[PDB]
Design a protein around this ligand. Structure first.
Ligand SMILES: FC(F)(F)Oc1cccc(-c2cnc3ccc(-c4ccncc4)nn23)c1
Ligand SMILES: [Cl-]
Length: 344
């Protein structure tokens, strides 16, 4: 019958019903949320006797194909992360159910965007930020293992989950957009706020694009707001240039999409194309002041508060700037990010 025998909605999602029992094994409790891939559902595994989160993929070839890549990437991670000490959500198994691929995960709590909303977008503390930063650098270290070389390609606050509302532990979720070094190279990957300059410029990219995203995420987690909130690629590039200046000439010379944001003057120098919206001149929106290094943190909301010293902010800003290096050949890599003084 049409609509998968009446089991699916107009968006190829399985219509979730509380209390349903799948495979005479999973007792579905309730829907947790939806994403572009489909839905995540809270369930009780009768066999293992534990709560699980089941990701129900949309009943559509394009989404099924992405989930098949995710399964392959998580299974290859499990072969190297059997202790699970590396901070990636753990896939327990998968199965097909009513023409939906279902991935069974350990149950986690809500995501880092939800954590910001509980904060009313005032940000979490610098100490909590440091703890988040340390775990994500360790995760990026694990993904950089040569036999893995996995690029997540969609790091953002909604793709990082707390294990538990009362603890600082986090895990990275959702590898449906992910890939390994040496596969297809795409335009328009990564969520726009977190999209690296390499990808905007249509250049080849590697694991460093996740570090760029990480840098943007960490500032957001403390300020409460995206660092670079582009409405489109040109706005996105221009907002990056406000904080970090014009990209180096050697990179723009190599960039296939450079002329979409920049032009060369007769003397050979690269300048922003003018499109209305007017931007701060390049490099004048100093991150020193977005973080309010000498002025009580973002918006002054940390004035008079311990664990927020000027030296802490100077170390934080230094680490962030290394993560937002324009050149992916020198952008700080996970191993050395973990030796930065912000963590000592
Ligand atoms: F927003 C939606 F994701 F739809 O629903 C949500 C929203 C807030 C949390 C979760 C949640 C709780 N415990 C887990 C474990 C894994 C996963 C996951 C794995 C792979 N890909 C995506 C998610 N999610 N999850 C799912
Ligand atoms: Cl600065």
């Amino acid at each position: 019958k049409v609509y998968n025998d009446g089991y699916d909605d107009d968006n190829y999602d399985y219509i979730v019903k509380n209390g349903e029992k799948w495979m005479d094994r999973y007792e579905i409790d309730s829907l947790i949320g939806k994403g572009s891939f489909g839905q995540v559902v809270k369930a009780y595994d009768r066999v293992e006797q534990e709560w699980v989160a089941i990701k129900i993929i949309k009943n559509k070839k394009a989404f099924l194909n992405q989930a098949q890549i995710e399964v392959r990437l998580l299974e290859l991670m499990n072969k190297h992360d059997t202790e699970m000490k590396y901070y990636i959500v753990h896939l327990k198994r998968h199965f097909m159910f009513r023409n939906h691929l279902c991935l069974v995960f350990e149950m986690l709590s809500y995501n880092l965007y939800d954590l910001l909303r509980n904060t009313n977008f005032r940000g979490v503390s610098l100490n909590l930020t440091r703890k988040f930063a340390q775990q994500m650098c360790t995760a990026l270290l694990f993904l950089a293992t040569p036999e893995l070389s996995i690029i997540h390609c969609d790091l953002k606050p909604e793709n990082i989950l707390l294990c538990n509302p009362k603890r600082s532990a986090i895990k990275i979720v959702d590898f449906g957009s992910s890939c390994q070094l040496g596969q297809r190279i795409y335009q328009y990957i990564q969520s726009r706020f977190y999209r690296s300059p390499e990808v905007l410029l249509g250049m080849p990219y590697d694991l460093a694009i996740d570090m760029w995203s990480l840098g943007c995420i960490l500032v957001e987690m403390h300020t409460g707001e995206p660092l670079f909130s582009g409405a489109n690629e040109v706005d996105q590039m221009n907002k990056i240039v406000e904080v970090l200046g014009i990209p180096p000439a050697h990179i723009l010379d190599q960039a296939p999409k450079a002329r979409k944001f920049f032009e060369k003057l007769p003397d050979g120098t690269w300048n922003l194309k003018k499109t209305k919206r007017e931007y701060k001149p390049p490099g004048t929106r100093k991150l020193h002041n977005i973080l309010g290094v000498e002025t009580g943190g973002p918006g002054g909301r940390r004035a008079g508060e311990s664990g927020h010293t000027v030296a802490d902010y100077l170390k934080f800003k230094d680490l962030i700037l290394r993560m937002l290096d324009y050149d992916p050949k020198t952008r700080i890599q996970p191993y050395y990010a973990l030796q930065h003084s912000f963590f000592k």
